[PDB]
């Protein structure tokens, strides 16, 4: 299947408690491989996956430079946005950026991304054509006119089709024994009496990679779209993921319910029954 590379950066002001903090992380699919933290001691881009440690000292110098520069840029961008919105310096504000690319099984470019959020909501984003911008409000329209005048989209298009793609393919090769694997979910069901009249059936999916998965309950073959409790997919901490889905059932009716698991590491979707 396809693969993605993403970098996520967060800049947070903390008025009266220091200068803004900048954190950046890089992912291939659901595997983190680098980070930078403006508060940390090293002041360096740091490895977080075995397969990136082989990159030489010039990789780390160049990457450290680009991310420290982004850090300074977004620090100034918080000041600019404050001014655009005429917001008070007392407030704590947030600037998030996401960029990266998708490639197919043959490694061809599938999609690029370059987008910003301010205080948790859309600010400006590069459209799929990699030629135009979507601006969320009047402040971002100022930025949009600025970036149109400086041809910023041409530079981001070039990065996304060129360097971003080349890096992803390279990372996919160097970490092939780790990144191109799938781990199928290990599955089971637990049963927890509520009262004398009701019990919870919980359907479990453990140790899977990648994180994408679907768990659904059926009663006599019919979906239980809204009496189902679902938790957010969570990391185990070892590079695999976990999720469960629960349904409240009247005691004696446990056998009418089926749980259904879809994951790309499965050749066929699973059906589980108490």
């Amino acid at each position: 299947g396809s693969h993605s590379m993403r970098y996520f950066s967060t800049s947070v002001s903390r008025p009266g408690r220091g200068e803004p903090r900048f954190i950046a992380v890089g992912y291939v699919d659901d595997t983190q491989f680098v980070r930078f933290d403006s508060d940390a001691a090293s002041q360096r881009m740091e490895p977080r996956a075995p397969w990136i440690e082989q990159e030489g000292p010039e990789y780390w110098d160049e990457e450290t430079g680009k991310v420290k520069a982004h850090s300074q840029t977004d620090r100034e961008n918080l000041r600019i946005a404050l001014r655009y919105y005429n917001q008070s310096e007392a407030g704590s504000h947030t600037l998030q950026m996401m960029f990266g690319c998708d490639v197919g099984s043959d490694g061809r470019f599938l999609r690029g991304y370059h987008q910003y959020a301010y205080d948790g909501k859309d600010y400006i984003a590069l459209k799929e054509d990699l030629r135009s911008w979507t601006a969320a409000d009047m402040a971002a329209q100022i930025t949009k006119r600025k970036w149109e005048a400086a041809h910023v989209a041409e530079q981001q298009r070039a990065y996304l089709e060129g360097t971003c793609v080349d890096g992803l393919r390279r990372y996919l090769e160097n970490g092939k024994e780790t990144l191109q694997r799938t781990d199928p979910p290990k599955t089971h069901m637990t049963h927890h009496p509520i009262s004398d009249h009701e019990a919870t059936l919980r359907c479990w999916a453990l140790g899977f990679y990648p994180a994408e998965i679907t768990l659904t309950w059926q009663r006599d073959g019919e979906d239980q779209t809204q009496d189902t409790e679902l938790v957010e997919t969570r990391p185990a901490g070892d590079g695999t993921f976990q999720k469960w889905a629960a349904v409240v059932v009247p005691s004696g009716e446990e056998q009418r319910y089926t749980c259904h698991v879809q994951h790309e590491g499965l050749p066929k979707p699973l059906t589980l029954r108490w």
Partner: peptide
Amino acid sequence: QYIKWPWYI
């Protein structure tokens, strides 16, 4: 590979 160019709002 990180972006080579950041620009101002």
